[PDB]
From a paper:
Orai was identified as the protein that forms the channel’s pore and STIM was identified as its regulator. The channel is activated by the depletion of Ca2+ from the endoplasmic reticulum (ER), and as such it was characterized as the calcium release-activated calcium (CRAC) channel responsible for store-operated calcium entry (SOCE) before the molecular components were known. The channel is formed from an assembly of six Orai subunits that surround a single ion pore, which is perpendicular to the plasma membrane in a cellular setting. Each Orai subunit contains four transmembrane helices (M1-M4) and a cytosolic M4-ext helix.
We also obtained crystals of K163W Oraicryst in a P42212 crystal form that diffracted X-rays to 4.35 Å resolution, which assisted with model building and was indistinguishable from the I41 structures of WT and K163W Oraicryst. The K163W mutation corresponds to R91W in human Orai1, which is a loss of function mutation that causes a severe combined immune deficiency-like disorder. The structures of WT and K163W Oraicryst reveal an ‘unlatched-closed’ conformation of the channel that resembles a hybrid of the quiescent and open conformations: the ion pores are closed as in the quiescent conformation but the M4/M4-ext regions have conformations like those observed in the H206A Oraicryst structure. The conformation of the M1-M4a portion of the channel, however, is like the quiescent conformation, and as such, the pores of WT and K163W Oraicryst are closed and indistinguishable from the pore in the structure of the quiescent conformation. The density is positioned roughly in the center of the basic region in the structure of WT Oraicryst and located in the lower portion of it in the structures of the K163W mutant, which removes the top ring of basic residues from the pore. The K163W mutation has no other apparent effect, and this is analogous to observations from structures of the quiescent conformation with and without the K163W mutation. Congruently, we observe that the corresponding K163W mutant of Drosophila Orai can adopt an unlatched conformation with a closed pore. Our observation that the unlatching of M4b from M3 does not necessarily open the pore is consistent with studies indicating that STIM1 can bind to loss-of-function mutants of human Orai1 that have constitutively closed pores, such as the pore-lining R91W mutant.
Numbering used by the authors:
A (entry chain B), D (entry chain B): 148 to 180, 189 to 219, 240 to 313
B (entry chain C), C (entry chain A), E (entry chain C), F (entry chain A): 148 to 180, 189 to 219, 240 to 327
Write the structure that this text describes.
Amino acid sequence: WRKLQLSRAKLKASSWTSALLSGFAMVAMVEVQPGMLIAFAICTTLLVAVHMLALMISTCILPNLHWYIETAWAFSTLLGLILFLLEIAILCWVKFYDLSPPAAWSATVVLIPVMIIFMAFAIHFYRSLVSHKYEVTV
Amino acid sequence: WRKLQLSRAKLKASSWTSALLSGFAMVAMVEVQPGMLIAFAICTTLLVAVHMLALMISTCILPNLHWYIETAWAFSTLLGLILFLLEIAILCWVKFYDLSPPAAWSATVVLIPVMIIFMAFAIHFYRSLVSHKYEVTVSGIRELEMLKEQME
Amino acid sequence: WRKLQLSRAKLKASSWTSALLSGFAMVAMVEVQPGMLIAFAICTTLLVAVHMLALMISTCILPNLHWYIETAWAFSTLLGLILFLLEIAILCWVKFYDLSPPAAWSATVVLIPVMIIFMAFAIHFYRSLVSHKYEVTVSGIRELEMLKEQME
Amino acid sequence: WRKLQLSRAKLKASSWTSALLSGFAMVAMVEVQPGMLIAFAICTTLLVAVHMLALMISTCILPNLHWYIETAWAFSTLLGLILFLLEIAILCWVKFYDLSPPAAWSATVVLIPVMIIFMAFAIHFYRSLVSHKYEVTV
Amino acid sequence: WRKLQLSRAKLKASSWTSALLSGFAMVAMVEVQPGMLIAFAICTTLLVAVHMLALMISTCILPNLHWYIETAWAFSTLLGLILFLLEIAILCWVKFYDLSPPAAWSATVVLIPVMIIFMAFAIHFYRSLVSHKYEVTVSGIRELEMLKEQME
Amino acid sequence: WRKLQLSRAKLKASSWTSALLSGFAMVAMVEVQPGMLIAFAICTTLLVAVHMLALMISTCILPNLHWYIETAWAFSTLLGLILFLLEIAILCWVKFYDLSPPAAWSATVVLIPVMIIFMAFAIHFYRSLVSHKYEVTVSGIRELEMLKEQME
């Protein structure tokens, strides 16, 4: 029971953001329509693609290894999550590099602190977890 | 009970994305408003149409073969899913081919890697499934025969 | 219980799409702002109107024939569903007919295939259903007669 | 129990549409930005206002006559519902009366059939209901 | 149980509108981009701010006086509710005062009727409530005294 | 049970706003497209980033210290909440600073009041809470001692 609730809630939660954030970003890109443009195209294309994985995983998990797909799901979500933040930075870039280049720097500069803590917080949480799997084993 | 929850949650989940992704894409296309344009019109028209199937399936499943429609539903969703990803690529194309054509190439190029793994991951998951339907069939019939043999 | 869940889930599901797809389409039309324009105005006006029916039905079903309104609801949803798909096609038309008319044809042409299978898939599913209502009816009277025969 | 579910589901359902349709219409009006303009301003202002009633009713019903507010709620929703349809028609009007006036006529003309069946379907359903309240009484 | 459902449903309901209406209004303002402009900036800034309160209250209520915060929540929601309606009026103003000033008057004029009934309906409902808290206090204390008198 | 509901409801509630408010703000910024611009880029970049934390926390909490992450979650949400309100102000600024600078001042000026009460209301609620944790602690040891005294 406690295992079924953790799946049902998570299922809706994942589909929720993926579709929203993805669809939102797509609309954002086309809305604003030198070198950074090479990233804007890739950063966006990856976002939609990454989230799709999570969504397609939301379709395959219902019928059905559980600890394997569970990872593909979480990893996909996280990958897409960081990307969305990566997206906003690129936007400030292009959205400002035409009329106000000076302010744009702060956007990419302010991204650095947060991007680090993000991937960092994920590590600490994971490390403490592996320690438990071993602790319980002994 | 475990079967009813898997349906209720799935039902809302499917309707959720279909309506959102579809409606979102439609707004995206009209928002930006050479040859690629032939695809942008088709790629989008299919997306809305494909998702609609899933939605219309969300309406017919409630009243009511179950393993048949279940496929039409999943297949539709998956088809629409890949399309959305196909959509974003086409957008980078048109959204850039005017001012910055050079970067656009990466978008369609970076799509290839992901599009493959997508349709590929769907195959591996499906294959492992069919193997189980057969596995259960053999073990199941065997156990039964064992009982049939002793009955005699 | 199984009947209450099928209603609660369906209720939210219907309201969900209707409001989303409807509101989305409305925003789409005004966003882009020869003969096809006569359809764009009608196709859209119907979409909002059709979905509204389903929504207003979501309000009247809670208090309260059940197989009658159930049809008005499903029919409305389906009508609005096909319309949304009809909408996207009209959009490619107007969204391209200004700068790129040539590609637009594929959109309406590609729509035909899918639109057919859509209304077609709905028929096959419905037909198989009616066959069951009859099948169960015959089986039902038979079981009863079996009991009536032994009673004697 | 069957009474609590009918309230919880209805509650979310009402809030759902009201906020969505209302917010959507508002965005629609400002997006496009002779005589019909007098209606576009009134038709929209009423929509947001009407739905708000339903929303504010979604806040007061939780604490707490039940058949009275139940009416204000349903009536508000229905009023806002018809208005949204009324809105789309007005949009085709203004959205076309600049470049393509000819097609606009169909929008308002096609609205008539549906608007009638709408208010009509509401009557038939209500009439059959009153007949039951009397039937049960006898 | 009946108290937990009233909280869970209300929680989602509040977060729902606040985020939607707020985010929607913000997008509306920037979308259209003499004296009324002084209000458009304030009316909007308050809306987002007011709803935020309700949202932040949706975060603090889960852990945890109950009749106090319950008021801050309801009051915030209501304040934001009326504001949204106040917003639409201001929009007709700015959205029209450029090309069609004449029609705009009706928008602000038609707002007056509804804005009054809104704050008015809130009063009647609240008044009837306070009357009950007092009513229960008297009947409740009376029943108790009746028992206290007999005890002696 | 009462602990599982408080988590499930909160989970959806958090994901809800984060994705909505974040995505909405992003669309708002690009939609409008002197010194304040330095803030608009930073204020927005932080919003998306902050909310992401809450979202990523919505993914890690399901598997699994509870009072620690619970804080990172609430703190993140609150940080993002205030930012959204900070965002609207910056918008009035840029959205008006071009054509109508005079009215913009009120937006940032009107923000001060509300921003204060916001962070202030959060403090009062928290303070009253800590007082209870201590109150219960004293009462708890007292009840126990009462039993310890009688035991003797």
